[PDB]
Every structure is written in structure tokens, then in C-alpha cells.
Amino acid sequence: SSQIRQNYSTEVEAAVNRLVNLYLRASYTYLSLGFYFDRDDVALEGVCHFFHHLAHHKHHGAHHLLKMQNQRGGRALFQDLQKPSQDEWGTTLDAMKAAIVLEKSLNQALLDLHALGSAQADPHLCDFLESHFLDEEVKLIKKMGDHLTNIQRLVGSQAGLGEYLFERLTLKH
Template identity: 45%
Template structure:
């Protein structure tokens, strides 16, 4: 197969291109984890439809982020390289709080990756990639971390049982 070079590629360092491919994989991995969480909370023996919906929505959002990075990569003349998506290491959650804390840590991991990508773009004098990240991802990521932090605090406060049921109703 003949590997042609993109005609639109300009000031797009191969390290930035590779980091975007890693970010695509991380976003898909996060989507996969949230999908797993949604199915856990949707089970009849767990029956928390608000959390099920929240995690399904979160899964869709992460997949949308992956698609945004794919389209960006193509617009810059980069090549999208798909890697295996790591399966979730955990598929059972003993409490809603445990799952929410896991989600919070996942969002922090995604944020760290975005910040490293932003720094890489700066190091390679690529204002386009830094602007893309600032305009589409960084603020939203901080908001997500804040939202999940509030959710974990609420879940700690309400405890198990009826409190989780009431919290779940808020998410529906």
C-alpha cells in the first residue's frame, strides 16, 4: 500500500500526532468504562436508573470526544492509528460512591493527558492544537471534575440505602 503524504499538513509535529492518537484511545477507553458502569447500574439486582443514565450519557460524551480528536487529526493532515482499547479492569461496584470516585479519578487521568498534550503542542510551537484543546476540552474537563467531586461529596453525605435512592432520582 502506498503511504501518501497529506497535502494539508503544516506545522504538525509527529509527536503531537502520536499524542492525539493516544488521546483518541484514552477517550474510547473512558467511554468503554462508563458503558460498563452504566450496565452495572442498569442491572435488575442494582436498579439505579439515574446512575445508569448518567454513565450512559458519560460514555456517549467520551466517544464524542474521541470523534472530535479523529476529525481534528484528519483536518491537520495526520493519520489516525487505532490501538486496542483496554477493557475495564473493574465491572462490579459495591457502592454508588465507589463508582463515582472511580469516575472522578478517570476524569482526572483524562485531564492530565489533555494537559500533557497541550504542553506538547506548546513545546512544538503549535498554536492550533493548543487553541483546539483550550476551546473544546480544558474548561469542560475542569467542569466535569468539579461535578463529579460534588457527586462524591453528596454520596458520602447520604450514605447507603434511601440516600442513594434519592441521589439516583436526582440524576433521572
């Protein structure tokens, strides 16, 4: 029986715990993507840094959701975290395609939770997602789309050259 809980539905509490799982799964996926690009037989430092920074960002997102759960008087509940969908991530292009799929799934989870908060008349939850997550997701997906276009442009008939140039001249090393 919570001393602080007010206007915080069990449905939102549960959805917040599921979204924490999704963010931690996303962080784990980005950890795996980064270390694949660090392999001596892949060796694309800028791609490794791009994904490791996203791993840190998704962990921070989980921390914000868990802090908000406690601020509202909900109860953090952790589930098993599934391994990433692949052990090897192919080319930079394959990896950036897999990343935008992942981000679109996170974005839909955020929109779904926002819609539940709207239906539950939970404006604190709706504001929380707007201020911490919805514009970060739109900006990240726009950046990944920009990268996909530049990677695609660079394939031509010299894939290796393009993959090197993208990593050297667009990403940070």
C-alpha cells in the same frame, strides 16, 4: 507526503492517536458502569443514565480528535482497546470515585498534550484543546466532586436510604 500538513509534529500526531485510545477506553468504562447500574439487583436508573451520557460524550471527544487529526494531515491509527478495570462497580459512591479518577487521568492527558503543543509552537492544537476539552473536563470534575460530597453526606448509618435518595432527588430518571 501530505499536501496539507503544516506545523504538525509527528510527536503531536502520535499523542493525538494515544488520546483517542484513552477517550475510547473511557467511553467503554462508562458503558460498563451504566449497564452495571441497570442490573435488576442494582437498579439505580439515574446512575445508569449519568454514566451512559458520559459514554456518549467520551465517544464524541474521540470523534473530534480524529476529525482534527485528519484536518491537520495526520494519520489516525487505532490500537486494541483494553476492557474496563472492573466487572462490578460497587456502590454509587465507589462508581463516582472511579469516575473522578478516570476524569483526572483524561484531564492530565489533555494538559500533557497541551504542554507538548506549547513546546512544539502548535497554537492550533493548543486552541483546539482549550475550546473543545479543557473547560468541559474542569466542569465535569467539579460536578463529580459536588456529587461525591452529596453521596458522602447521605451515607450516615442508613447507606441504602441515602443511595436511593441521591438517585431519586439529584440524578435524572
